[PDB]
């Protein structure tokens, strides 16, 4: 039996909006430490890793470890029926044939109970090592979303160059080319508003903008985004879900022979 009660239901909603368009089906690993999820997209070019720690929920209880196969479109449909101020409780039986979602509205006269059917999925999961990256950029998530969307007008691929003093984003297509240069913030007043770069060696990689525009759907989860780059290693785009966990998108680069 698994039961977790989360007062800020909006977080769950945003998570599902950050996943439903990239991957259709995913296995949720429930354990005493919390909720974990990992899935590549259908093309295997990108990967999503979600972690929601038990300490982040208002109440958490997991007796035996569970693996719930979920169609993410169905779960997002169910969660759109929740309000941003609802208290959301997830519950599953020991056999866990279905997953129950209880939404307690802020009107205090409305309680909703949804029962989502679960299925048995055989998902390909990868071993992601914990490593140190040659270049790390921390920037406002909205600025990053705007950059990816804007450069999608210019071309299909973006070249990210992380250097000591700043980071540059490059796109090229039939109509021409463009470069956006974000210098390291000189007057760091609000840490959420700043561009900071931690570098060991400068890094330069090429990525597909369609996947990045899928990634940026996590923007409502965090005011900042962190991009981690090493040479010929897939890039990591990290949104921290405050005081609970994170959502990480991994993107394989386009490499010249």
């Amino acid at each position: 039996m698994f039961e977790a009660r989360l007062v800020q239901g909006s977080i769950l909603k945003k998570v599902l909006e950050a996943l439903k368009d990239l991957i259709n089906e995913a296995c949720w690993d429930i354990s005493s430490s919390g909720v974990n999820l990992q899935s590549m997209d259908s093309s295997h070019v990108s990967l999503v890793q979600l972690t929601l720690r038990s300490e982040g929920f208002d109440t958490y209880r997991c007796d035996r470890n569970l693996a719930m196969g979920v169609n993410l479109t169905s779960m997002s449909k169910i969660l759109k029926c929740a309000g941003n101020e609802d208290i959301i409780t997830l519950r599953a039986e020991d056999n866990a044939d279905t997953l129950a979602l209880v939404f307690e509205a802020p009107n205090q006269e409305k309680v909703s109970d949804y029962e989502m059917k679960l299925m048995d999925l055989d998902v390909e999961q990868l071993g992601i090592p914990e490593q140190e990256y040659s270049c790390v950029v921390k920037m406002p998530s909205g600025e990053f979303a705007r950059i990816c969307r804007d450069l999608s007008h210019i071309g299909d691929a973006v070249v990210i160059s992380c250097a000591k003093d700043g980071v540059k984003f490059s796109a090229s297509g039939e109509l021409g080319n463009g470069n956006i240069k974000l210098s390291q913030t000189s007057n760091v007043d609000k840490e959420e508003e700043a561009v900071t770069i931690e570098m060991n060696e400068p890094v330069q990689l090429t990525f597909a903008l369609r996947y990045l525009n899928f990634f940026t759907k996590a923007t409502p989860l965090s005011s900042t985004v962190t991009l981690s780059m090493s040479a010929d290693v897939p890039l990591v785009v990290e949104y921290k879900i405050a005081d609970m966990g994170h959502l990480k998108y991994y993107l394989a680069p386009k490499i010249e022979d």
């Binding site: 999961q125 386009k254 010249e256």
Partner: peptide, 13 residues
């Protein structure tokens, strides 16, 4: 000149 896959870097397991 080639889009790589996540499996080109990480093993499945």
């Amino acid at each position: 000149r080639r889009q790589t896959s996540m499996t080109d870097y990480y093993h499945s397991k």
